[PDB]
């Protein structure tokens, strides 16, 4: 078996290899990449997402989110306080202000150390889940707005025709902006392109070990676990690498830089943080291998994890027994 230690693999496709998206995902899996739960893909030198980022400042962040932490440095939750709208230009200025800018640091490891030491003591502001795309329409390879849809995948594999769409999201981050531990809706894949700016550090648990992370999370967040048997899909809980190591949880870490893609695989728990101002684009997708995962995916029915109406069909078809309960939750 390939990649038995579940290491994060890094791929360097040639321009020819970059033509057929599906084929390359399948290739990465043939090499065991999925075992890690996350892979990095560095595009060929001839590729670009768009010509420049000079003209993005007028994008609106309709509901910036202030990420207010509670707990202890290595075990905390975050809640998202809504703020007044602002443009990307305004957000960038805020990120670079003395209150929010990245501190002086020696390297990525020193910054990681500062993050886990001090994150709770600050409340960075996050632009999240903004429908849109920054890929040029003429970019034919790895254009996250032009992928095959999950609905079409489900139709091709299972013969059922369903409603719903599948479009990308933009994320605008600053120092200490945090994404909590989670797997995707219905344990889908995700793909993530860092368009512009400072790095984004990722942590990931191998899919074969995701239940170990869940068990730890129930111990560390006991009231949340009593409230919902799938509370990680609320996307609020953070656990540091130090705490994961103390508890024997298998995981890996890697830093993504501008111009790089990250793929998360079905049931690969991930979390991470931004180093400074940046802009990313992401979308969920499926392959034939996902179907099994979608059938088995846990669900939040407590009401906290509201999601896209696209999800309805996925639950309805893949998990008919669970559908009426999940729907009440929505
Ligand atoms: N699936 N992709 C993710 O969970 C990353 C979400 C994110 N990327 N930048 N800010 N938030
Ligand atoms: Cl700091
Ligand atoms: Na490892
Ligand atoms: Ni995710
Ligand atoms: Zn819930």
Question: Which 8-state DSSP code applies to residue 62?
Answer: S
CB atoms within 10 A of CB 222: 10
Please enumerate, as own/partner, the contacts of 320-326 that have beta carbons within 8 Å and a separation of 24 or more.
325/299, 325/301, 326/299, 326/301
Give percent helix, percent strand, percent coil of the chain, each to the nearest 5: 30, 25, 45
- Please give the distance, rounded to the nearest whole angstrom, from the Cα atom of residue 321 to the centre of ligand 1: 30
If DSSP codes are grouped into helix, strand and coil, which group holds residue 147?
coil
Query: Tokens at residue 224, please?
Result: 């949340």
Distance CA 144, CA 42 (A): 15
Domains observed in the chain: 1-330 (2.60.120.650)
| Under 8 Å between Cβ of 36 and 8 | yes
If DSSP codes are grouped into helix, strand and coil, which group holds residue 252?
strand
Experimental approach was X-ray
CB atoms within 10 A of CB 328: 9
The resolution of the experimental structure, rounded to one decimal in Å, is 1.2
- Please give the distance, rounded to the nearest whole angstrom, from the Cα atom of residue 170 to the centre of ligand 1: 9
**Mutation probe of ligand 1 site: the residue of 168, 178, 192 with most atoms within 8 A of C-beta:** 192
Distance CA 264, CA 274 (A): 17
325 CB contacts (<8 Å, ≥6 apart)?
Answer: 299, 301
59 CB contacts (<8 Å, ≥6 apart)?
Answer: 87, 88, 130, 132, 170
- Please give the distance, rounded to the nearest whole angstrom, from the Cα atom of residue 321 to the centre of ligand 5: 18
Place of tokens 């090499």: 31
Distance CA 249, CA 123 (A): 28
């Amino acid at each position: 078996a390939q990649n038995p230690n579940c290491n994060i693999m890094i791929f360097h496709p040639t321009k020819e290899e970059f033509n057929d998206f599906d084929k390359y995902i399948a290739y990465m899996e043939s090499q065991g990449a999925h075992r890690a739960g996350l892979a990095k893909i560095i595009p060929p030198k001839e590729w670009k997402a768009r010509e420049t980022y000079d003209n993005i400042s007028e994008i609106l962040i309709a509901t910036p989110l202030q990420q207010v932490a509670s707990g202890r440095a290595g075990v905390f939750t975050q809640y998202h306080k809504k703020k007044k709208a602002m443009t990307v230009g305004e957000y960038r200025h805020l990120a670079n202000s003395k209150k929010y800018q990245t501190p002086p640091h020696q390297n990525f490891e020193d910054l990681e150390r500062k993050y886990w030491k001090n994150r709770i003591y600050n409340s960075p502001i996050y632009g999240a889940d903004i429908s849109g795309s920054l890929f040029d329409e003429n970019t034919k390879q790895w254009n996250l707005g032009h992928l095959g849809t999950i609905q079409d995948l489900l139709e091709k594999e299972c013969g059922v025709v369903i409603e719903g769409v599948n479009t990308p999201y933009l994320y605008f981050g600053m120092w200490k902006t945090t994404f909590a531990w989670h797997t995707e809706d219905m344990d889908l894949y995700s793909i993530n392109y860092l368009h512009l700016g400072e790095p984004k550090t990722w942590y990931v648990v191998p899919p074969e070990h995701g239940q170990r992370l869940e068990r730890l999370a129930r111990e560390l967040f006991p009231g949340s676990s009593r409230g919902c048997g799938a509370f990680l899909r609320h996307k609020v809980a953070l656990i540091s690498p130090t705490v994961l190591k103390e508890n024997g949880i298998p995981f890996n870490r890697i830093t993504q830089e501008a111009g790089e893609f990250m793929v998360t695989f079905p049931y690969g728990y991930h979390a991470g943080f931004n180093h400074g101002f940046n802009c990313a684009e992401a979308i969920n997708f499926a392959t034939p291998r996902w179907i099994d995962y979608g059938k088995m995916a846990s669900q939040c029915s407590c009401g906290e994890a509201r999601v896209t109406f696209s999800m309805d069909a996925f639950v309805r078809i893949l998990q008919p027994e669970r559908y009426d309960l999940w729907k009440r939750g929505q």
